[PDB]
């Protein structure tokens, strides 16, 4: 229930952190190029098909398409002034229309209606142009509570993605809503991983004392940047980065495997 991650697994978990830091290079979103180094270190024939940008809540994004990976990526990034982002968030409640007993934190749901008409027609016109490709969706720290959310729409509101050729990943993510939400999550059966960071305080906020609950399984970066931890459970155990807490920090949210996660640095 709680094993060492394949080397494999952690390329893999890496090469998503990498994407995921793509998006905050202002160059890529709003500058609509794909000539950042992560951006060409991860993806090389990327080709940007839209950037969208919320002024209001900062809440930026993209899709991107690759031939060569038969690959769609989504991905997002809230504001990166990390710090007041924690200290100036509301562990307040919105119901989760589409699931009956469920509940999503009010404010990452409102940034996230902000953008929907923003990708998701983009996202629908690729894969009538690619029937064939595959959709991740992906982002860090708050971009990870509208990658959930993302996914889980385009799940509920597009009939051409499933577990097949739909998946998600977070590096960074807050938890987002309720426990029934939680339990819907691993319901779709969609493949949700969710990388956090040693000591990195924003995996542990809005807290379970407040009644959130993150899906998806955990894996855990212990020391460095080959020591992770999976706790293969599909809802969230206290056997991986619950463990550390009191013990948490802001600056581990700030790099992932060693790639800059705020700066594009």
């Known amino acids: 229930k709680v094993v060492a991650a394949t080397t494999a697994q952690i390329q893999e978990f890496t090469k998503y952190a990498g994407i995921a830091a793509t998006a905050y290079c202002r160059s890529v979103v709003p500058g609509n190029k794909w000539d950042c180094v992560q951006c060409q270190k991860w993806v090389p024939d990327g080709k940007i098909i839209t950037t969208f940008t919320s002024l209001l809540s900062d809440t930026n994004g993209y899709v991107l398409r690759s031939d060569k990976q038969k690959t769609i990526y989504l991905v997002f990034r809230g504001t990166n002034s990390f710090r007041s982002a924690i200290t100036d968030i509301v562990f307040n409640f919105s119901d989760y229309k589409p699931v009956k ?149 802001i600056l581990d949210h700030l790099s992932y495997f060693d790639i800059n996660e705020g700066s594009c640095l």
């Open 101 to 249: 007993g469920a509940k999503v934190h009010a404010g990452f749901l409102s940034s996230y209606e902000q953008v929907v008409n923003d990708y998701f027609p983009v996202v629908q016109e690729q894969l009538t142009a690619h029937p064939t490709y595959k959709v991740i969706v992906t982002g860090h720290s708050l971009g990870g509570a509208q990658a959930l959310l993302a996914g889980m729409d385009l799940y509920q509101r597009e009939p051409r993605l499933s577990p097949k050729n739909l998946s998600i990943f977070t590096v960074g993510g807050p938890r987002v809503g309720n426990p029934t939400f939680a339990y819907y999550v691993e319901s779709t059966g969609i493949p949700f991983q969710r990388t956090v960071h040693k000591r990195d305080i924003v995996p542990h906020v809005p807290p379970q004392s407040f009644g959130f609950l993150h899906p998806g399984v955990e894996s855990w970066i212990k020391s460095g940047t080959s020591n992770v931890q999976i706790c293969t459970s599909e809802i969230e155990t206290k056997d991986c980065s619950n463990s550390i807490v009191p013990f948490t920090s």
